[PDB]
Design a protein around this motif. Structure first.
Motif, short mmCIF file in Angstrom:
data_model
loop_
_atom_site.label_atom_id
_atom_site.label_comp_id
_atom_site.label_asym_id
_atom_site.label_seq_id
_atom_site.Cartn_x
_atom_site.Cartn_y
_atom_site.Cartn_z
N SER A 332 0.96 -1.23 0.10
CA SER A 332 -0.07 -0.18 -0.11
C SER A 332 1.04 1.08 0.00
O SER A 332 1.57 1.47 1.11
CB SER A 332 -0.92 0.04 1.27
OG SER A 332 -0.02 0.14 2.16
N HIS A 333 1.01 1.87 -1.10
CA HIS A 333 1.92 2.99 -1.42
C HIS A 333 1.41 4.48 -0.55
O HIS A 333 2.37 5.34 -0.66
CB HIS A 333 1.94 3.43 -2.91
CG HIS A 333 2.82 2.37 -3.49
ND1 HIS A 333 3.48 2.46 -4.41
CD2 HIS A 333 2.70 0.74 -3.47
CE1 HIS A 333 4.16 1.32 -5.17
NE2 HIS A 333 3.41 0.59 -4.26
N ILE A 366 -4.03 4.27 -2.73
CA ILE A 366 -3.66 3.30 -3.72
C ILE A 366 -3.10 2.20 -3.09
O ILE A 366 -1.96 2.15 -2.48
CB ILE A 366 -3.10 3.96 -4.83
CG1 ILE A 366 -3.11 5.48 -4.69
CG2 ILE A 366 -3.18 3.39 -6.34
CD1 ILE A 366 -4.65 6.05 -5.25
N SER A 368 -0.94 -1.33 -4.30
CA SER A 368 -0.42 -1.94 -5.68
C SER A 368 -0.42 -3.58 -5.24
O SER A 368 0.25 -3.99 -4.33
CB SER A 368 0.76 -1.70 -5.74
OG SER A 368 1.69 -2.08 -6.94
N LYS A 373 -1.29 -1.01 -9.92
CA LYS A 373 -1.93 -0.35 -8.92
C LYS A 373 -3.33 -0.40 -8.83
O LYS A 373 -4.04 -0.95 -9.73
CB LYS A 373 -1.61 1.27 -9.07
CG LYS A 373 -0.04 1.42 -9.22
CD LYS A 373 0.31 2.94 -8.98
CE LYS A 373 1.84 2.97 -8.60
NZ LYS A 373 1.99 2.26 -6.97
N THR A 375 -6.52 2.21 -7.05
CA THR A 375 -7.31 2.96 -5.86
C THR A 375 -8.31 2.36 -5.29
O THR A 375 -9.07 2.07 -5.85
CB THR A 375 -7.37 4.33 -6.82
OG1 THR A 375 -6.55 4.70 -7.51
CG2 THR A 375 -7.86 5.51 -5.65
#
Ligand SMILES: CC(=O)N[C@@H]1[C@@H](O)[C@H](O)[C@@H](CO)O[C@H]1O
Ligand SMILES: *[C@@H]1O[C@H](CO)[C@@H](O)[C@H](O)[C@H]1NC(C)=O
Lengths: 438, 52
Positions: A332-333, A366, A368, A373, A375
């Motif tokens: 999870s970025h 977002i 990944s 990715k 959202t």
């Protein structure tokens, strides 16, 4: 390859990250700070302890004269007395009416039990910090231990990993410290060579078994005034005992950040403050080409239910369509949320769950999955149980506590009076010109 | 025997008692923050946490 990252200094809080390279799939990278170690350099000033007043029997010169003589013993005190009349169980010891004289002297030496009761003064400076790191990548784990100074790397599998320097220096230790029987005390002990009776450091010896001692403890002799022979000495209460009585709480119950202090190295351990910048180099063989990496198609989120809990309580599900059986990474970025597992299996059209921990009620970010990715957003509610000891704040709050509804209300609140004033001025000038037409 | 209050820190607290090892207890928020689609007094929640 080389990748830089900032990690909070705190034990038992894994930090997840990725590394991006064209033609290579992301490599999940977990960093865990197993235990910190702050070890300052110290110098032994001296040692002290409860003392013992040696009182050798008085010299007696009978029916003649005598003179005092000094000595090298610690706190040595000497004094003669004429007109004395020593008496003993056998009777008068010797005979001349007041012509005799007796010399009395006293000195001070450490008590034998001191061999275990000693208190050592120390001067500390230049605190240095040692970090134990455990790094996981590609389901391969490595352990390392490095100085926080950023010029010396850690040695592990002939791999070099630089760390630090600390963002903000912290050292619970003060300039002057005193250690006794495994307890550390923060105290300003008197400097060596300077004594003061009735206070710590009244007896000072360069070493516990040093023949040379220096000490003054206000020993004053008194003139004999009894029939028999007896040397009366009056002295101030031992300083070490009085320091023991009111020493206060030790440094264990005062050190901030919960530092566990151990004595034999005189070092703090397992305590958290500040951040650490670390650069990790990964051998190229670790990376896997994207050609063999599974590819995910048509990925979609779903937040079955989320809780804005201190611990890791939020849930998440992902639906994917893939073509090759294998494993890919996950992350999870957005900093506000931290996932639990990094790598997961993939199927042709399977769906998989995940557990994640957040710190903002509006859990929107977002995530990944493997190479792509996605959202996704949802709302989380505060938890019923409002006290726990488990790892908390895997990410610090970033003023993200504001909900989407709060933002909507704030937007709907503020009015565009600027447009109103502009239109008013425009119509004002237009009407002014029209009237100027007359 | 008695009862003792302790203002647990927002970030953590240590607990030592007797001769057995201590325990660490931390805290989080529990006020009713997010609304339910209708007008609500959300401020009270943000008054409980970060009152200033
Ligand atoms: C009795 C003796 O041995 N010495 C005393 C001396 O202490 C005293 O000062 C003096 C009269 O003042 O008489 C003599
Ligand atoms: C580590 O991950 C790779 C990538 O799928 C896999 O081929 C390998 O078998 C894994 N190693 C272990 C020990 O599971």
């Amino acid at each position: 390859f080389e990748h830089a990252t900032t990690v909070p200094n705190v034990p038992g809080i894994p930090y997840k990250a990725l590394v991006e390279r064209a033609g290579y799939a992301p490599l999940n990278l977990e960093i865990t700070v197993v235990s910190s170690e702050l070890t300052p350099s110290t110098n032994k000033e001296y040692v002290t302890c409860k003392f013992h007043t040696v009182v050798p029997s008085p010299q007696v010169k009978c029916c003649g004269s005598l003179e005092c003589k000094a000595s090298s013993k610690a706190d040595y005190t000497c004094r003669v007395f004429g007109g004395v009349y020593p008496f003993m169980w056998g009777g008068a010891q010797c005979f001349c009416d007041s012509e005799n004289t007796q010399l009395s002297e006293a000195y001070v030496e450490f008590a034998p039990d001191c061999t275990i009761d000693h208190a050592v003064a120390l001067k500390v400076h230049t605190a240095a910090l040692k970090v134990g790191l455990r790094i996981v990548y590609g389901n391969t784990t490595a352990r390392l231990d490095t100085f926080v100074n950023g010029v010396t790397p850690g040695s592990s599998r002939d791999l070099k990993v630089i760390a630090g320097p600390i963002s903000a220096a912290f050292s619970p230790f003060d300039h002057k410290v005193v250690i006794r029987k495994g307890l550390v005390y923060n105290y300003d002990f008197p400097e060596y060579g300077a004594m003061n009776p009735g206070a710590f450091g009244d007896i000072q010896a360069s070493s516990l078994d040093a023949t040379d001692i220096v000490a003054r403890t206000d020993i004053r002799l008194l003139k004999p005034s009894v029939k028999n022979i007896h040397v009366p000495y009056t002295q101030a209460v031992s300083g070490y005992e009085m320091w023991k009585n009111n020493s206060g709480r030790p440094l264990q119950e005062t050190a901030p950040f919960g530092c566990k202090i151990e004595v034999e190295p005189l070092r703090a351990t397992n305590c958290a403050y500040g951040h650490i910048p670390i650069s990790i180099d990964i051998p190229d063989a670790a990376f896997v080409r994207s050609s063999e990496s599974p590819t995910i198609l048509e990925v979609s989120c779903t937040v079955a239910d989320c809780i804005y809990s201190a611990d890791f309580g939020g849930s998440l599900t992902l639906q994917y369509k893939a073509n090759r059986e294998g494993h890919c990474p996950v992350h999870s970025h957005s900093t506000t949320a931290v996932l639990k597992e990094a790598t997961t299996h993939v199927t042709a059209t399977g769906s998989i769950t995940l557990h994640f921990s957040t710190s903002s009620p509006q859990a929107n970010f977002i995530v990944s999955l493997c190479g792509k990715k996605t959202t996704c957003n949802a709302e989380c509610k505060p938890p019923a149980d409002h006290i726990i000891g488990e790892p908390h704040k895997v990410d610090q709050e970033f003023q993200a506590a504001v909900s989407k509804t709060s933002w909507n209300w704030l937007l709907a609140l503020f009015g565009g009076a600027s447009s109103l004033i502009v239109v008013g001025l425009i119509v004002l000038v237009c009407s002014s010109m029209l009237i100027n037409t007359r | 025997t008695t009862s003792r209050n302790f203002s647990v820190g927002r970030e953590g607290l240590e607990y030592v008692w007797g001769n057995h090892e201590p325990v660490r207890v931390w805290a989080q928020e529990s006020a009713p923050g997010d609304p339910h689609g209708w007008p609500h007094e959300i401020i009270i929640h943000y008054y409980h946490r970060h009152p200033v």
